Amino acid sequence: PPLPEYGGKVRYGLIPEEFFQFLYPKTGVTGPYVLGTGLILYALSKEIYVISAETFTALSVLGVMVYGIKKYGPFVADFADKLNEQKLAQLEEAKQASIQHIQNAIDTEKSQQALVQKRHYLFDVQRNNIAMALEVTYRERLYRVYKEVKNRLDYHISVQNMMRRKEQEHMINWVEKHVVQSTIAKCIADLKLLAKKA
C-alpha cells in the first residue's frame, strides 16, 4: 500500500488547518486568532498560566527549536528524501541486473542449440573422405592396369622399331661396302657427257 504524499497541513507546527476551516463559516478569517488571543489573555489574567522562571526557560527552548527546525529542516528533509531515492535506485538496478543475467542465460542456451544443430559436419566430412579415398584408389588402379598393358605393348613396338633401324643401317652400309668390291664403257661415257655439256 503506497503512502500518501503530504501530511495534514498544520499551522505554526501546532494547530491543523482543519480547525481554521472549521471556524471560518462562523467567525471569518479572524475567528481562530481572536479565540487564541482571548484564551491566552484569559489564562494570563487569571493565573492559569503563572509567569515564572519556566516562562523564560520555555521561551529559550522554543526559540532554539524554531531556529533549529527553520535552519536544519531543509537539510533533514532532503537527507531523508535522498536516502529513499538511493535505496530505490539501488533496488531498480539490482532488479534489472537479474533480468539481464537470466536473459543472458537464455541467449547462451539458444546458442548451444545453434551449435548442436551445426553438429552434422563431422560425419559428412568423414563420409566425404571415405568416398574420395575409395574413388582415388579405383582410378589409380585403372591407370595402373592401363599403363602396364600399354607399356608391354609399347616395349614390343619399340624393340621392333629399333630392330628395323639397326637392320636397315647394316643393310645400306653393307650394300655400299659390297658394291665397292665390284668398264671402258663408262670410261668413254664420261668424256661423252663432258662433250654433251656444251
Partner: protein
C-alpha cells in the same frame, strides 16, 4: 560421387578440444583427396589396338594381351566404412536431441522466472518479506546470527 558440401568454420565450432588434431587431419585429408582427384582424370584412355595391330609384327601376342584386358575383372573397392559412421551419426543425433530437450526445459524455466521478475510489485509498495522472496540474497541469516541485528555490525 555426389558429395556433401561443407562449411569449414561450422565444422570448426563443433570439435571438442580432445580431438582437434583429428579434425585437422580429417580436413587435411579432405584437401589432399580433392587435390588427388583433380590431378587424375576419370577413366583411362583405352588405347586403340590399331597402333598395336598394324605395327606389332608378332604372332597374335597383342591380340591375347587385349582379350585378357577386355575380360579383366578389376576389383571395385566397397565402402565397409560408411555404414558405421552413419550409425555413429544416428547415435550422436540421439544424444543431441535429448540434450536439446533438456535445454528447452531450462529455457522455459528461465522464461517463467523472467516473467516473475518483470511483474514485481513496485518497490515503494513492497514489504520486506516481498523483497526476501524476490531476491532471496537479501534475507537475514537468522540461523547463523540469531540475535539482533541478525548480521555483522560491520555490514550495517
Amino acid at each position: 560421387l555426389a558429395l556433401k558440401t561443407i562449411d569449414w568454420v561450422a565444422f570448426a565450432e563443433i570439435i571438442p578440444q580432445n580431438q582437434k588434431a583429428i579434425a585437422s587431419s580429417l580436413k587435411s585429408w579432405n584437401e589432399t583427396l580433392t587435390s588427388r582427384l583433380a590431378a587424375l582424370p576419370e577413366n583411362p584412355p583405352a588405347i586403340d589396338w590399331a597402333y598395336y595391330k598394324a605395327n606389332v609384327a608378332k604372332a597374335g601376342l597383342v591380340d591375347d594381351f587385349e582379350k585378357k584386358f577386355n575380360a579383366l575383372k578389376v576389383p571395385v573397392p566397397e565402402d565397409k566404412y560408411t555404414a558405421q559412421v552413419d550409425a555413429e551419426e544416428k547415435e550422436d543425433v540421439k544424444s543431441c536431441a535429448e540434450w536439446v530437450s533438456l535445454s528447452k526445459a531450462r529455457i522455459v524455466e528461465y522464461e517463467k522466472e523472467m516473467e516473475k521478475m518483470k511483474n514485481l510489485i513496485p518497490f515503494d509498495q513492497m514489504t520486506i518479506e516481498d523483497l526476501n522472496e524476490a531476491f532471496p540474497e537479501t534475507k537475514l541469516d537468522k540461523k547463523k546470527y540469531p540475535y539482533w541485528p541478525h548480521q555483522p555490525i560491520e555490514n550495517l
